[PDB]
Design a protein around this ligand. Structure first.
Ligand code: SF4
Lengths: 77, 167, 356, 110, 89, 167, 94, 146, 305
């Protein structure tokens, strides 16, 4: 019988869309750019981070755009 | 409300058909797993009976410790064989008449009228509310003597099970 | 006495074999090894093919070390025709044969440590196959053994990688040696099995690690003066602890002895690729010649009765590990289902030379 | 062990208690399972003809011990009979499986 | 409030396990029926403690004790059955 | 000379059903997970790239198959019967390999034993060849739309007793 | 009172209806005699009942002094004497 | 990924010769082949990694030449053609076209790819579904370089 | 309103544990890609749909109800005990006066599912494997509940939210790492060893959806053992040495369960099988007496408290 909050809208939905939109591309980018430049301490904390930060990566799992150009090539397709 | 007592009647029907599965199935394995279903329903009835440490204690001890060894001995099938094991005319007669006495005893008794009485020793002493704490204070020092006795009973049960089951 | 089926897809990966046991309880007591699974019929086809046509066929026998098979099947016609191999190509053959012995023992202890991981040995194995690619060009399917020696010459990068292999390899070997002294689960899970002694391993059929497990300094190439073995450093394992860890010390000492032979042969260089090549095609004679070489599993053998034709009249192979498979019916009597994995590991066998 | 058969494409001996498609346990009832992989057409009248031909072949070819060598011989000449039946056009192909490798060769313009 | 129906279910168990305890081919089916009888008495004690005795949980304490003794009985009965299974061939 | 299919129509022509078919087919083309099946010269690719013999429907035959291997192999395909197919990853699962002329106890390919989608060059290629093979197979399954769930059993049998002579 | 486990009944209902529904959507859309482990379970059952006794005592030990301490000390003394019996006999043997 | 558009079907019914520029990143290639198969068509496979003289293989009944293992004779027989027998491999009438799925853009010779695309213009029921040298994305460029 | 607000913590918890078992699958794949050297995140859902869309594969044995409910009870024996985890000071599913005791009961009904699996499969392979799996679930239960009992004896409470609060009084040293590291080692070996992971089948007739049920049941067993590692020894939401406290506390406990996932998978890859004899030698003659020993130690130690 408390109702300590009394907020109708835009309290946790804002934090939910923040954590589900701003976080996962930077998290996946840190997974990309630090794939080799890491200590096993760093890989340990990155594994803990990607374990903590899983279900936001659902809108970024099929999409992959800036991933493959290890040269200076031309689109000769 | 109605979901509570309808869940009670559902557990009753499932538990009675599981018990008839214990009694009247050709496979003893099927009977043992119907016993497991019955004891899950017993634990759910004890949850319904507001006795939750009792509920998970019966769930812990009586399929997790009993029915494992039951199904061990049932899959290791051994051998086959006035209240005595002589049936088809005796146990049906005494079963029906003791069933009729118990149905005329339970149904023809105003139980809630008796719940209205002896109400002073269930007013739930205010300084504690928690069920497992109350079980522990009534079990450790109040009924101290059977608590000390089942230690001896299970000691002798373990020692006799070793001295028999090895041979 | 519930009969185990012992199916084709084993929980381990050491070939396909059949080891039906009555196993009263968990104690296995009676073994009936059924074979014939990975069978090709090498003898009749080898009678139907020439030496240059059964010479691609010598790859399906001990493919964890393919240098031994083609080495003995080319050393057959060399001593048969009495054609001299020069010292340079013969010593490079010694180096690559001991490197294949290294490869055979490490590719034994890889999946053996996996059953009882893969990249703990594959860090070495990538440079090992780089050495095989710089030596002949293939991974394990080389065809580079002629009468005069190696079919090609060594390039200028392979001798540098051979110089670098010693301080690339021996350090991780001695880092892998201390594990059995440290880790007591190898002191408690493979300890005990292998209770045969020396007077009994000579008695049945045994050779290789099962014969050197009893403290016998046994070697074919030391008894038979072959490839100047008494010039190089030798230490044949006289380890007399008997059991499976005695066999593991046997295999560590054999790898270290081969490391010492290659390390003394790094700067030897005493001489062309193939001596006596006037013509591409030749024949064979008719003698009574049984040639053998020191296998990593113990006395691989080639039996030959000639035809004075293009085809050999008789071509029978004595594989080391198949004679070494006879002792498990006697090493099955008082062990467990958790022990037979260690048994079929410590035999050190693949089914390529078994059925053949 | 318990399996005693010489099972290939379109010929499977399967001497077991198999009335329906549920396998079992093992007996003298040789259940000839034909076309596991859906490789040809196999109309029901032609299947009855091939099954009757196989029945006549196992009736005239028995009398010796029905061990595995007779099973190899009878599956082999049953496959010869199926090949000479499909070559004469009694058995067309399928083109409803995911391979259709034309296992007996393409029919010519001859 | 039909909550007195769980007593009727208790008496149903107490009759069916007793019927299975009389007519039983082997021993372990009758032992399981005996365990259903101990369940019937057990849920009777739990129901009566729920209805009447909630300050002291005397019915629930006795539930703990009767399930302990049910465990001991089942353990020794299966020990006897297993010793029979050893002593037959 | 082939047979004729039915080819009536495509009943599941909504956007949701074809979307679910495409997603389930692409996820089916994504999750290979072979039961390995090595035990031969093609086992060597496993270290560079379960145990329940009814689980993994997407097995590739990476082994030298013989005549004595064939009854267990067709039994294992009976243990993977309906959903998926096998990939021949050996010249001996294709043509009998290097012993295609004169070998008696070696089958000339499993192309007379089991339906095969993809044929390999055979003897241990590079470890990315199996990756290209499963990618091709993924392109093959992506062409498949689960055949619109269209089902036929032959059931050819004689109930006359054979002229048997056991041991 | 149906407040402690009021969400737990719905949790049970969802979790119990989901495997049968999974079976429906998967069906529409496409003699040993070893008694050593028996003997382990036979020691297990009585040690498990003794743990069940140890559960509400340690729940309710805070309100009680050294008296409940020596109560369960005698109890676990019986327990460890049965365990030493299990050591010294042919009980585990594995 | 998964851009919901049947524009590749419009390309295959308009141009019928498109280089499927798509990686080795799993099976993201057969979904348009599955949409062509669900339209009532029939699709069969080929590969240009070992296909030489492609117009002489799709037509003109290229020879069988069974590989004898030193035991049988040469037996120079004439096997039926690739796509003529595939047009003969359409038993019903509802099959509108035949898709020829080609999955090898390398070792292909630009001239012979134009010859094979002209052979897709020879029969009206033939669809060329060649590869596109494995780009990173999914691109359906037509036969312009060939 | 009468059921939506009640259903949505259950729904959010089921979605959370599905994401967690996705984490465990791809995280064992990531540690295997570290020790063995994007699309891969959805590859685990592709695995789940490959195991989902399959054949029923029922043989001719007449145990069809037990064949149905075998892997079902094997799933229930983990899934029913996710109502137990205090991720923060809030967002626990129930108040749950007996916190970990219900988990011990639901983890103790797992050999019922193991024996139902051993009988649902008409194979002596899975028969012997169900006997072994049920026997090791039985055998490793006693030091498990012993160290459970010792932690609940330190806290003098069984309800998990109370013990999670109770660990934060002395501070960083107030956790049960510095109170019972011996019992922590007990809970480590009991957590890793029980789920057929640290030592080692029995699915030789279960396929299709039932194989996926055993799959998700094993990895959810790993999930719930890891979450009890968090709420017993490492702490629930406290880092001492409104709405945002819940959001940071769920991150704290997920970092702790990721820590235990990395430790558990690494210890799996660096230890072999105990070969089934040292397994029982451990759990009966060694692990159970030392669990009783540190039970006696924590029993003597709570006299002054
Ligand atoms: S084709 Fe050769 S390498 Fe491949 S599996 Fe067969 S025998 Fe082995």
């Amino acid at each position: 019988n408390q109702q300590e909050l009394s907020s109708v809208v835009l309290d946790i939905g804002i934090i939910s869309v923040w954590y589900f939109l701003v976080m996962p591309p930077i998290i996946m980018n840190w997974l990309r750019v630090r794939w080799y430049r890491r200590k096993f301490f760093e890989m340990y904390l990155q594994f803990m981070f990607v374990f903590m930060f899983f279900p936001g990566l659902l809108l970024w799992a099929p999409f992959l755009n800036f991933r493959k150009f290890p040269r200076d090539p031309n689109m000769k397709n | 409300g109605p979901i509570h007592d309808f869940l009670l009647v559902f557990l009753g029907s499932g538990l009675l058909v599981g018990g008839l599965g214990v009694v009247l199935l050709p496979n003893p394995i099927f009977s043992a797993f119907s016993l497991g279903f019955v004891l899950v329903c017993i634990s759910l009835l004890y949850i319904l009976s507001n006795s939750h440490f009792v509920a998970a204690a019966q769930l812990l001890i009586y399929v997790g410790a009993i029915n494992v060894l039951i199904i061990f001995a049932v899959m290791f099938m051994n051998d086959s064989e006035n209240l005595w094991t002589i049936g088809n005319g005796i146990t049906s007669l005494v079963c029906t008449t003791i069933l009729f006495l118990l149905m005329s005893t339970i149904l023809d008794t105003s139980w809630y009228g008796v719940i209205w009485t002896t109400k002073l020793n269930q007013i739930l002493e205010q300084d504690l509310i928690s069920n497992s704490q109350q079980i522990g204070i009534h079990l450790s020092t109040d009924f101290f003597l059977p608590f000390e006795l089942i230690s001896i009973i299970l000691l002798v049960a373990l020692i006799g099970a070793i001295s028999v089951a090895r041979q | 006495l519930m009969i185990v089926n012992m199916g084709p897809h084993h929980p381990s990966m050491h070939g396909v074999l059949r080891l039906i046991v009555t196993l009263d309880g968990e104690d296995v007591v009676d073994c009936e090894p059924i074979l014939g699974y990975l069978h090709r019929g090498m003898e009749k086809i080898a009678e139907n093919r020439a030496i240059i046509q059964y010479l691609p066929y010598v790859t399906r026998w001990d493919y964890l070390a393919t240098m031994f098979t083609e080495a003995i099947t080319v050393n057959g016609p060399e001593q048969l025709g009495n054609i001299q191999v020069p010292k340079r190509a013969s010593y490079i053959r010694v180096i690559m044969l001991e490197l294949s012995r290294i490869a055979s023992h490490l590719l034994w202890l890889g999946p053996f440590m996996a059953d009882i991981p893969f990249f703990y040995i594959f860090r070495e194995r990538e440079f090992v196959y780089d050495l095989f690619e710089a030596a002949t060009g293939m991974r394990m399917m080389h065809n580079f053994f002629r009468i005069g020696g190696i079919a090609a010459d060594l390039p200028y990068g392979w001798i540098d990688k051979c110089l670098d292999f010693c301080d690339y390899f021996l350090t991780e070997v001695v880092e892998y040696q201390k594990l059995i002294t440290r880790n007591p689960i190898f002191l408690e899970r493979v300890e005990g099995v292998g209770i045969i002694g020396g007077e009994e391993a000579i008695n049945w059929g045994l050779s290789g690690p099962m014969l050197r497990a009893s403290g016998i300094p046994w070697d074919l190439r030391k008894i038979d003066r072959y490839e100047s073995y008494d010039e190089f450093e030798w230490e044949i394992q006289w380890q007399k602890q008997g059991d499976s860890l005695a066999r593991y010390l046997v295999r560590l000492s054999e790898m270290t002895e081969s490391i010492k032979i290659i390390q003394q042969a790094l700067e030897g260089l005493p001489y062309r690729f193939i001596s006596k090549k006037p013509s591409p095609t030749f024949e064979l004679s008719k003698q009574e010649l049984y040639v053998r070489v020191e296998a990593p599993k113990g006395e691989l053998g080639i039996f030959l009765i000639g035809d004075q034709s293009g085809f050999p009249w008789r071509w029978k192979i004595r594989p080391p590990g198949f004679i070494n498979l006879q002792i498990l019916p006697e090493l099955v009597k008082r062990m467990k289902l958790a022990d037979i994995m260690t048994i079929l590991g410590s035999i050190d066998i693949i089914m390529g030379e078994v059925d053949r | 062990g318990q399996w005693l058969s010489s099972v290939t494409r379109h010929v499977r001996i399967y001497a077991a208690y198999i009335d329906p498609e549920t396998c079992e346990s093992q007996m003298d009832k040789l259940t000839l399972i034909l076309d596991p992989t859906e490789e040809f057409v196999w109309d029901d009248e032609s299947c009855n003809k091939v099954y009757s031909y196989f029945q006549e072949l196992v009736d005239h070819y028995e009398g010796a011990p029905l061990t595995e060598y007779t099973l190899r011989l009878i599956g082999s000449d049953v496959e010869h009979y199926i090949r000479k039946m499909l070559f004469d056009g009694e058995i067309q192909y399928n083109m409803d499986a995911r391979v259709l490798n034309f296992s007996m060769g393409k029919p010519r313009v001859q | 409030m039909i909550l007195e129906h769980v007593l009727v279910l208790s008496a149903y168990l107490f009759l069916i396990g007793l019927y299975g305890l009389i007519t039983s081919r082997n021993m372990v089916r009758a032992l399981m029926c005996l365990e259903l009888i101990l369940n019937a008495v057990n849920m009777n004690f739990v129901t009566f403690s729920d209805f009447f005795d909630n300050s002291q949980l005397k019915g629930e304490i006795f539930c703990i004790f009767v399930i302990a003794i049910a465990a001991a009985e089942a353990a020794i009965g299966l020990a006897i059955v297993s010793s029979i299974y050893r002593n037959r061939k | 000379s082939i047979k004729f299919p039915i080819l009536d129509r495509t009943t599941k022509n909504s956007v949701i059903s074809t979307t679910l078919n495409d997603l389930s087919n692409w996820s089916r083309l994504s999750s290979l997970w072979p039961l390995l099946y090595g035990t031969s010269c093609c086992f060597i690719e496993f270290a560079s790239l379960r145990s329940s013999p009814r689980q993994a429907d997407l097995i590739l035959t990476a082994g030298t198959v013989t005549m004595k291997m064939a009854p267990s192999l067709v039994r294992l395909y009976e243990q993977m019967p309906e959903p998926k197919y096998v990939i021949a990853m050996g010249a001996c699962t294709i043509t009998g390999g290097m012993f295609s002329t004169d070998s008696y106890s070696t089958v000339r390919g499993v192309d007379k034993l089991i339906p095969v989608d993809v044929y390999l060059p055979g003897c241990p290629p590079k470890p990315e060849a199996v990756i290209d093979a499963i990618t091709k197979l993924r392109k093959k399954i992506a062409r498949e739309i689960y055949k619109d769930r269209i089902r036929r059993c032959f059931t050819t049998n004689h109930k006359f007793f054979v002229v048997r002579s056991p041991h | 009172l149906l407040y402690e486990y009021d969400i737990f009944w719905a949790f049970l209902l969802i979790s119990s209806a989901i495997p049968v529904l999974a079976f429906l959507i998967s069906g529409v859309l496409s003699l040993q005699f070893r008694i050593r482990y028996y003997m382990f379970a036979l020691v297990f059952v009585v040690f498990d009942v003794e743990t069940v006794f140890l559960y509400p005592w340690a729940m309710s030990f805070d309100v009680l002094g050294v008296s409940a301490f020596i109560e369960a000390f005698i109890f676990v003394l019986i327990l460890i004497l049965g365990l030493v019996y299990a050591w010294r006999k042919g009980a585990l043997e594995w | 990924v998964k851009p919901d558009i049947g524009q590749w079907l419009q390309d295959v019914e308009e141009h019928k010769a498109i280089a499927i520029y798509a990686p080795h990143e799993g099976g993201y290639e057969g979904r348009y082949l599955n949409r062509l198969k669900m339209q009532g068509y029939y699709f069969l496979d080929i590969s240009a990694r070992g296909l030489g003289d492609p117009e002489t293989t799709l037509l003109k009944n290229y020879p069988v030449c069974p590989a004898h293992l030193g035991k049988q004779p040469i037996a120079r027989w004439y096997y039926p053609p690739e796509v003529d027998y595939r047009l003969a491999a359409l038993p019903p009438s509802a099959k509108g076209l035949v898709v020829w799925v080609l999955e090898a853009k390398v070792l292909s010779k630009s001239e012979l790819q134009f010859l094979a695309l002209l052979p897709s213009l020879r029969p009206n029921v033939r669809v060329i579904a060649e590869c596109g040298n494995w780009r990173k994305f999914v691109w359906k460029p037509l036969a312009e370089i060939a | 309103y009468g059921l939506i607000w009640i259903f949505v913590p259950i729904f959010s918890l089921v979605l959370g544990i599905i994401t967690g078992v996705l984490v465990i699958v791809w995280l064992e794949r990531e540690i295997s890609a570290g020790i063995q050297q994007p699309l891969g995140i959805l590859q685990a859902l592709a695995d789940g749909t490959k195991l989902l869309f399959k054949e029923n594969l029922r043989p001719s044995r007449g145990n069809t109800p037990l064949f149905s409910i075998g892997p079902s009870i094997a799933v229930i024996s983990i899934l029913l005990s996710y109502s137990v985890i205090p991720f923060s000071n809030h967002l626990v599913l129930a108040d749950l006066n007996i916190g970990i005791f219900l988990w011990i009961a639901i983890s103790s009904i797992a050999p019922i599912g193991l024996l139902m699996s051993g009988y649902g499969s008409n194979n002596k392979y899975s028969f012997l494997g169900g006997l072994r799996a049920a026997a090791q679930s039985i055998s490793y239960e006693i030091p498990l509940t012993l160290c459970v009992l010792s932690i609940s004896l330190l806290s003098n409470s069984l309800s998990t939210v109370d013990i999670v609060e109770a660990q934060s009084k002395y501070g960083f040293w107030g956790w049960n790492l510095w109170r019972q590291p011996i019992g922590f080692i007990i809970f480590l070996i009991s957590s890793l060893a029980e789920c057929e992971r640290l030592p080692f089948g029995y699915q030789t007739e279960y396929s299709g959806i039932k194989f996926g049920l055993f799959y998700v049941a094993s990895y959810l067993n790993l999930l719930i053992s890891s979450l009890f590692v968090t709420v017993l020894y490492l702490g629930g939401w406290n880092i001492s040495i409104q709405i945002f406290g819940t959001t940071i506390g769920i991150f704290i406990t997920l970092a702790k369960t990721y820590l235990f996932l990395f430790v558990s998978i690494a210890t799996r890859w660096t230890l072999p099988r105990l070969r089934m004899d040292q397994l029982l030698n451990l759990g009966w003659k060694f692990l159970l007496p030392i669990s009783l020993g540190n039970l006696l130690l924590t029993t003597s130690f709570q006299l002054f408290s």
